Design a protein around this nucleic acid. Structure first.
Ligand SMILES: [Mn+2]
Ligand SMILES: [Mn+2]
Ligand SMILES: [Mn+2]
Lengths: 152, 152
DNA sequence: TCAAAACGTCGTAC
DNA sequence: GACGTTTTGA
DNA sequence: TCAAAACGTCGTAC
DNA sequence: GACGTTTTGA
């Protein structure tokens, strides 16, 4: 687990509160025991003409990748272990998205428990709802209620 | 002059690179000698439900103000002297808007001597052209070229 | 005549 | 910015 | 059955 | 985000 520079984490936290995103999703998927995937994503979005900035995130964080689609690019970090290491060191300096980062950390630690029992899986989905409530959520479709209707 | 904490500047520089703006305008106004106002503005925009974040900025920067218009709020720093002091300390930590920051610092330093000759005024106006170029400019009307047309 | 505020608009880059 | 659906590669 | 990637959509908050 | 137009008041 790499330890990040403090001056870098301070800058990055500011940028993240601005144009970053801490996302938790419940993704419908038949090939899972509970018919859903718990997905977490750290994301920093930026215009493609400035993807050089996002490339430097890949170099400094040491993990993750950049995806271009249209006129816009995104730094993506999804791997649960590095994501937990990174958000642990970024969380103290976040102001607008601190709670989300903490809920994500909380979710990742309780991930193996989430597969064991349907009750635990539902409660973790409840935390995903809390992250969604704190973000500027507009197009959310799958909630813990959706999961509760499936776990029967 | 007010000295700013380094860690405060590092975070803020990040958030500025994300949701902030360094704006330089040539405002057409007949009351001025050269029929144009040189206007500099440091801006930080945010959804009005997160207004407190910007209200916090005023207390920390110690100058400037917050204005609401609908679902969007802005922190504005227009006062030339506190702006120069602020930007001087913030500039080292900027990555996306560092060039435009430093250009603003040069305009401010040349403002008084730019009121003396119409040629130096035009030279300064070109510095604001460089700023609008570095920005994601989409609705710009008054450039140095239009200033040149009026000075004849 | 000027610094600064006030008020307003629009198209993406989030 | 913050989601959505679908596929890959174990 | 999973983690992760790939691919795709949409409404503002910049 | 990044501009625009108009007004205030020494
Ligand atoms: Mn933002
Ligand atoms: Mn931005
Ligand atoms: Mn933004």
């Amino acid at each position: 687990n790499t330890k990040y520079n403090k001056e870098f984490l301070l800058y990055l936290a500011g940028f993240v509160d601005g144009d970053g995103s801490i996302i938790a999703q419940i993704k419908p998927n038949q090939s899972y025991k509970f018919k859903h995937q718990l997905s977490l994503t750290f994301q920093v979005t930026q215009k493609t003409q400035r993807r050089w900035f996002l490339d430097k995130l890949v170099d400094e964080i040491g993990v993750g990748y950049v995806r271009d689609r249209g006129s816009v690019s995104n730094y993506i970090l999804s791997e649960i272990k590095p994501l937990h290491n990174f958000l642990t060191q970024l969380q103290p300096f976040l102001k607008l998205k601190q709670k989300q980062a903490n809920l994500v950390l909380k979710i990742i630690e309780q991930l193996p428990s989430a597969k064991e029992s349907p009750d635990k899986f539902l409660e973790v989905c409840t935390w995903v709802d809390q992250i969604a409530a704190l973000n500027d959520s507009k197009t959310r479709k799958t909630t813990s209620e959706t999961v509760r209707a499936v776990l029967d």
